[PDB]
Amino acid sequence: QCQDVVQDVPNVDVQMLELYDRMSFKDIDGGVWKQGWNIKYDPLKYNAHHKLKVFVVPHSHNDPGWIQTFEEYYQHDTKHILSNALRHLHDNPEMKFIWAEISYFARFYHDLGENKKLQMKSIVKNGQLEFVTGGWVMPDEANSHWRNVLLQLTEGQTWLKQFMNVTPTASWAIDPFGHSPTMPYILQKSGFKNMLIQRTHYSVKKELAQQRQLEFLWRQIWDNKGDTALFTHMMPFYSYDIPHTCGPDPKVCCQFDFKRMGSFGLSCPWKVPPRTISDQNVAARSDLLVDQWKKKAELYRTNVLLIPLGDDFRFKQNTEWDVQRVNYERLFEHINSQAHFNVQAQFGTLQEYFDAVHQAERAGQAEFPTLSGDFFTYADRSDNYWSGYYTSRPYHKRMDRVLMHYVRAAEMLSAWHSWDGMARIEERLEQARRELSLFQHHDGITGTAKTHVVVDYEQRMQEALKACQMVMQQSVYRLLTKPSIYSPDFSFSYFTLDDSRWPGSGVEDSRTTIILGEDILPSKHVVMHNTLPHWREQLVDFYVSSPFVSVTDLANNPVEAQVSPVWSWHHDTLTKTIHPQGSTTKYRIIFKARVPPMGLATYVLTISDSKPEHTSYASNLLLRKNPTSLPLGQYPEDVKFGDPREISLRVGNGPTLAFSEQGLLKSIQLTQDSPHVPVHFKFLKYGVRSHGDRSGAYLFLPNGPASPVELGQPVVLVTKGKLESSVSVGLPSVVHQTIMRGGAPEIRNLVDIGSLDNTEIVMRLETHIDSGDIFYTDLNGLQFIKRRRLDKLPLQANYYPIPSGMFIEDANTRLTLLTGQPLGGSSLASGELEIMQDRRLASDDERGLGQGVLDNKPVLHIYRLVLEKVNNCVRPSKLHPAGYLTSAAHKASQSLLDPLDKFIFAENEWIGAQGQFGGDHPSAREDLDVSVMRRLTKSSAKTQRVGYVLHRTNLMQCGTPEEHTQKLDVCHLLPNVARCERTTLTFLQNLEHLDGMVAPEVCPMETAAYVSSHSS
Ligand SMILES: OC[C@H]1N/C(=N\O)[C@H](O)[C@@H](O)[C@@H]1O
C-alpha cells in the first residue's frame, strides 16, 4: 500500500547529487550573459502558425523586514505600492500585478475603508491582481522547519480564503538563498500545481539551461512513483531584477526598466539608459527587446515565455506605474502588429503563464524532465557561497525553534475545549502564529537583517512566547481542575512555565525558584505536558529553595529524585579564569516525569527537614590547578577538588563516556563488553580573508581551514548522580557541557563570542568512521539528504544547512548529531562532523545589508549525540539519495524540539487539582506525530471543527522487534464527531469524506491533514 522509501532508487532525469558529481563548476566568462554563453536562435523557429507567446508579469519584491522593520517598510513603501496598485489596476483593465507577502497585504487591507475593500476584491476576482504562493512571507528554505513553513503558508492562505476568496495554486520564490524540496512537498499537499524558483547556483543554471531542463517535475528524493512531483520553473539568470529577466544581456534589458531614466534616482550601471518609447524609436526598440526574448526562449521547451517585470519595492510611485505601463503598451502594440516578429506579448500573471505552458504540454509540444534533489549551497558568483546565513544570528535561530514548540503546544492544549471570547484565546494564538510566521522570512531566521530589525523580530517573538504561555497555562488549569470547581479568571496566571533550556543558564536568569519551607509553604504542584502522541518519560528539573525535597505523583507514590547544585559560570576578571560558582540559596531537583500521549501529568514537590528517602544527591568534582573552596549553602555533599585528569562516567545501563583532561569527550563505549569508540570533540575557529572578498551575514569566505581554539588549562566540573551526570568546561567563548541521563548524551554550549571580531567558532567531532566523502544533513527537519564533499569546490561550498541533524556512517558505525537550532555544518574529512556555533564579522559582504555581524549575544545551543552500530540496519543502496534516522536518533531529535513543557502552580493551594489528563489517548507508533492540532472554529459555531496534521517519518529497521501500538484516529479524539474529512495541509479544501468518521494513519514520509467536525 505504502511506497517503499528505502529500497527503490527513483529513476529521474536529473538527480542533483549525481549532477554535482559530474559537473565542472568552472567560472568562465560567457560574454554578455556572464555565467552562460552567447545564445543563438533560428529566426525561422517562430512563424504565423507558431508564435512566441510572451507574458510580462509585473511584480514588487517586498521584504517583511530587512534593512527597515516590517512596520517601517509598510509606512515608507508597501502601503504606497498597494494603494497605487489598487488605483492603477482599477483604472487600467489590461494591467496585471502579482503579490506574494500576505503579511503586508493583511496589514494594508485592514486599514482600508469598505469602498476600497470592494474595489480590491473586484481586481482580484477579475484576475488583474493575482496572489502567488499566498504565505504570510516568502520563507527561507535552509533554516526553517517544515512545520513553520506550513504554519506561515496556512496563515496567509487562511487570510486569503476568508477575505479575498482565493487560494493560490502557483508559488513564487524569487529570493530565498537556495531552495529546498520541502517546498514542493508542502505545496503539492496544499493544492499547488506549479512553483517558481530563482536563487540556484550559477553553474546549475548554466548546466540545466544547456539541456533545457529549467522546467522540471520536482519530486522527492525517495519518491519512486512520482506522486509528490510538482511542476517547477527555475529562472535562468543572475537576478530577478529587470536587467536579468528580459534576456541574457543585462546591458540591453536595463534599457527596458523605465524606472531607470533619472528622476527616480536609479540608473543603468551598463551605461545605456532606458529611452522613452516613441513612434520614431519603437521599431528599433522592439527589435532589441524581441531579440532578448527569443534568446531567453531558447532555454525553454514551449512557445510560452515568462518575463517578470519588477524589483525590490517597485510599483510605488504613480509616475512609476505610468512609465512602465505606457512604454510596455507601446512596445506590445508595435510587436504584436508586426507579423515578422511572430510574437504575441501581453501583461500577464504567473498562473496565466503556467496555464499556457501546460496547454502547450497537453498539445504535445513539450515533455518535461523529472528532477530530485535540492539547490544548496547557493553561490551567485565566483566562490561567493551563501553558507554564512546558515549560522548568522544564532540566538534568534534557536529562539525560532523554542517558539515553534510553544505555538504547537499552545494550539494543542487549548484545542481540547471551546473557549469563551472573553478568554482571548484566539487573539493570543493568532498573534503568536503571526509573529513566528513573520520570522520565517528570508531575512528573519536567516540572520541577514539590520541590527535594529533583528531586535524587532526578537521583541515580536518574545511577545509571542508570552501569548503562548498565557494560553497554555489557562488550558492546563481547565484541563486539570474538577469541572464543578473550575473558576477561571481569564486574566490570571495560574501557572508559570519553567524552561531549563531557553534562554538558558548564563543567557538569562529567568527561571523561578520554587520556595518551600516549614514556616511558609510545604509543597508545590507542578505539571508536565507532552505534545507528542505517545507515552513519554523524560527527566525534568526545577529550582527549589531547599535541597531537602521529595517528589510524589498525584496518587502520592514516591518518585525517585536527584538534587544537584545550581552552577553558573563566570569570567573571573580577577583570576582570568572561566569557572563555576555554586548557588547558596537554591538547588536543582530532577526526576523522571511520565506523561500521557498529548497529555498532562501532575507531581508534587514537598520539603522536609532532612534527606528524604527517595531523593539522592549528586557528587561534584572541580578539576583545576590552584583550586579554591566552593561552599553550597545547605547542599549536603562537599565539593571535591583535583588536578585536571581524564575521567569516565556511566549513568544507568547507558553508554560509558570518557573525557580528556580538558573536559571534552574522547570516547563512547556503548556496552560493558563493547570497544571504547573514539569520538573527540574539538573547538576551532575560522577567520576572514585580508585580501579579497570578506565574509558577512550571507557569505562564508574563510581564510583557510579552521585553527584549533587554544584552550589553556580550563576548569572542568564533573557532577555525578544516579539520574543525571555531567561534565562542563569553561573554554574561551564556550561553556561546553556533556550531560548523561542513561542514553545518548545531551550537549549544551553556552556560546559567547564576545569581542572576537572576524571569527567563526566551530564545534568538530573527530571519529574513525570510514565515511569517506559522504555525510547526511536534514532539510527543514523533514528528511535527510545524502551530501558528498567535493574537493572541486571550496570549503564554504561544502557547508550545508543543519536545520535539525546530520550524520556520518560506514558499514558498521553511525554518529548522528541532532540540533535544537539550525546552524551550518559539514564533514570536511572522513570521520568528521562539524557545526558552526557563532560568527562575528566586521565587514559587509556586498549583498545589500550594509553592516557586518557585530550584535552577537550569548546563546545556549543544544544537541544530542547518538553513536550507533548500524551493520544490521536495512539501509538504502549506494545510489539512493536519502538517508534515514534510527529510532534512537529520531527520539533524540524530538527531545530537543518538542520536550515536555513544565508548569509551576502559581499560588499556595490548587483546589480541585487532578492527577492526569489524556490517560485514555492512544499511544501511537513512534514514527507518527501529530504535528498540528488546531481548533478551527470559534465558540459560537454550531459545528465545531478541529484540524490535525499527521506526519509519519521513516525510521531504519535494525532488528528491534516492533511492539504493539494503538491505532491513532484523530477524528475520535474529541467527542460528538459528526464528520471526518481529509483536507489539504492548510485545512482549506476538503479532499475526502471519510467512512466511519475514521482518519487513517499515513505512510512513511507522508503528511496528511484531517478535520473533524463535532456537534456543539
Ligand atoms: O542580496 C540579498 C538581499 N537583497 C535583497 N534585495 O536587494 C533581498 O530582497 C533581501 O531579502 C536579501 O537579503
Ligand SMILES: [Zn+2]
Ligand atoms: Zn528578499
